C-alpha cells in the first residue's frame, strides 16, 4: 500500500496542474511543416513510402462469423488479423501525413476513421465474453474496454487531434462521430463501470493484477487528455486512472524484477512507464513518478536479465529466447536517468539504424519520433555490475569477466507462470546456455490446472536441482525458500530450499549455495534430513555434446563453448536424451536436450556436495 500516485495529488491538487486544451502535446502542430521536418529527420521519406503503399488499401470488414468463431473453435486470429491490418493502416497513414503535410493521405485517414466509427465495437472476439451477455459478438447495447479497444480509442483520439481541421473542411460529421465513438466506447464506460477486471477496483489481496491495468489505463488516459475539455471531468477521470494504477504499483515488488520475465516487460514495466510519462506531460511535469527508484529498477530489469545474442533469463514458463524495442528502452532510460538502459538500447540495435516504430500503437509510434536521432548517436554497450540482487522476487544475477553469467533464484512455487524451480540456477557461457532452464511449451490441455505438474518442463526433476530422498519439489504458496541471502562482494548466493519439498522428502534444511569467482562456479549442497529414506539425486539440464572422460568429470561442448563439471565420485552419472516433440521448445533448443542424472547408493542424514564448473 505505497499508494504513490494518490500521495502525489488529490483530485483538487490535480485540477490546478492539469494542462487543458491539449497544450501538452509534444508533437508540432500539423501545419508546422518546418518543425515536423526537424523532428522526422531521415524517418520522413521512409514514413511517406510506407503510407504510399496504403493509398489503395481496402479497409476490411470484420464479419459476424469471425467473432462467432471464437465460440465455435477458439480461433481468435480470424477476427484479429483484419482488425490489426486496419489499425496499422490507420497508424501508418497518420505518420505518413504528419511526415509529408500535403493532404495526400487525408482521404484514407478519413476512410479509416469513418469505418472504425461504423463498427459496433473495437473489442476483440476473445475478450468480448466479459460483457453481460458473455457472447463473443458485440452487443450494440453494451461497451467494455480491453487492450484492443483501448489502443483503438487512443489511435483515434490521435487521428482526431491531428487532422480535426482538414477533416472538418471535408465534412464536419466524421470528427463529430469520432468524438461520439470515443465517448461511448472508452470515456463513458471508463467512468461508469467500476467492475472491469483490469481496473482493480474491487481487487482483493491475492487476485491478480497484471499488465492490463497500466496498458488499458494508459490508453484511457490518452483518450481523456485528448478528448475531454471539461476540467472538472478530466480531473475526476485522471484521479480515477491514478487510483487504478496505484493498485498495480502496490502489487508489483519494489525490487523491480518482472517475475514473468522479459517477454512481458515491453507491455508491463513499459506500459507503466508510458502511463507515467503521459501523466507527467498532462500535468506539465507536476505529477511525475519518473525519478522513483522502483520505476528505474523496473526498467533496468530488462538490461540485467538480457544475457546476450537473444538469450534471456527464463525462470518459470518463459522463453529462453528474447528481445526488446530499442526505442522504448532508450526512452524509458532517459526518463529515469539510467545511462545503463540508454547504452543497452543502442546495444540491442546492433549496428542497425533506429527508425520509427510502426505497428498499431500511436503513442509508441509518435514518441519514437522524438527519441530517434539521439539513439543513433549513443554508444552500444551492455555495462552492468557483477551482481544484481532482487531481494523480494529472490533473483540473483552474478557474472564474471570470463563470460559466465549465473542466474539463481529462491522464491516460492506459486509464482506466476510457475515452475517448481526453487533454488535453481542457469549458467550461460558467453551468452550461450550451458546449464539451462527449458522454459515454455505450447499450451496443451493441461498447462493451466492440476495435471500442470505432470508436464516435464514444470517439474523440479527437470531443473538444476536435487531430488531429496529421491523426491521432487511440490506446487503451492507454502513451498518456498528461506534465508535467501546474497553477498554482493564475494559473489555468493545461498538459500534453504527445504520447505519447497513435501513432507515425504523428510528434510530439515537443504542449503544450496552458488559462488562465482573470476574463473569458476562452485555449487554446494548442505543438507540435514529428518530421516534418510532414499538416496538423493542431483540434475543438470544441458544441450550440445556431453561426455564423461573419467569418474567425477563431465564435458559439455555447446555452440563454441566448452566446460568441465566436477562432481563427487560418490555419484554415477548418466545422460537422458529428451526428444522435443513440442515445436515451441524445439524452436529454441532444436531436436533434443539432455538431463544429466547424478545418482548414488549413499544415504546419510547429513552431508554436502561440491560441484565445480569452469572452461577448458
Ligand atoms: Zn523452468
Residue numbers in the entry: 28 to 643
Provide text from the study.
In bacteria, however, a different strategy employing a class of enzyme known as polysaccharide lyases (PL) is deployed. PLs selectively target glycans composed of uronic acids with a C4 hydroxyl group linked to the preceding sugar in the glycan chain. This enables PLs to operate through a β-elimination mechanism that relies on proton abstraction from the C5 carbon of the uronic acid sugar ring, resulting in double bond formation between C4 and C5 and elimination of the preceding sugar. The three characterized PL33_1 enzymes were all from Bacteroides species inhabiting the human colon: BT4410 (BtPL33HA) and BcellWH2_04512 (BcPL33HA) are hyaluronidases from Bacteroides thetaiotaomicron VPI-5482 (B. theta) and Bacteroides cellulosilyticus WH2 (B. cell), respectively, while HMPREF1181_01744 (BsPL33Heparosan) is a heparosanase from Bacteroides stercoris CC31F (B. stercoris). The enzymes are 68% identical and contain a larger N-terminal α-helical (α/α)6 toroid domain (residues 21 to 401; BtPL33HA numbering used throughout this section unless specified) and a smaller β-sheet C-terminal domain (residues 402 to 635).
Crystal structures of BtPL33HA and BcPL33HA reveal a two-domain structure. The C-terminal domain possesses an extended loop region between β-strands 5 and 6 (Leu455-Leu484: BtPL33HA, and Ile464-Leu493: BcPL33HA), forming an octahedral Zn2+ coordination site [supported by anomalous X-ray diffraction data], along with the loop region between α-helices 12 and 13 from the N-terminal domain. The two domains oppose each other in such a way that a deep, open-ended cleft is formed resembling an active site that would be compatible with an endo-processive mode of action of BtPL33HA and BcPL33HA. Analysis of the five enzymes via SEC-coupled light scattering and SAXS indicated that the three PL33_1 enzymes BtPL33HA, BcPL33HA, and BsPL33Heparosan are dimeric, while the PL33_2 enzymes ObPL33CS and ObPL33Gellan are monomeric. SAXS data indicate that the dimeric enzymes all bind as head-to-head homodimers, generating elongated envelopes. This is consistent with PISA analysis of the crystal structures of BtPL33HA and BcPL33HA which predicted a buried surface area of ~1,388 Å2 and 1,006 Å2, and a complex significance score of 0.207 and 0.290, respectively. For all five of the analyzed enzymes, AF2-generated models display a closed tunnel-like topography housing the +2 and +1 subsites. The phenol of Y470 moves within 5 to 6 Å of the +1 GlcA and N-acetyl of the −1 GlcNAc, while F475 moves within 5 Å of the +2 GlcNAc, forming the tunnel topography. This differs significantly from the wide-open cleft observed in the crystal structures of both BtPL33HA and BcPL33HA. Fitting of both the BtPL33HA and BcPL33HA crystal structures and their AF2 models to SAXS data indicated that the best fit was for the open conformation observed in the crystal structures.
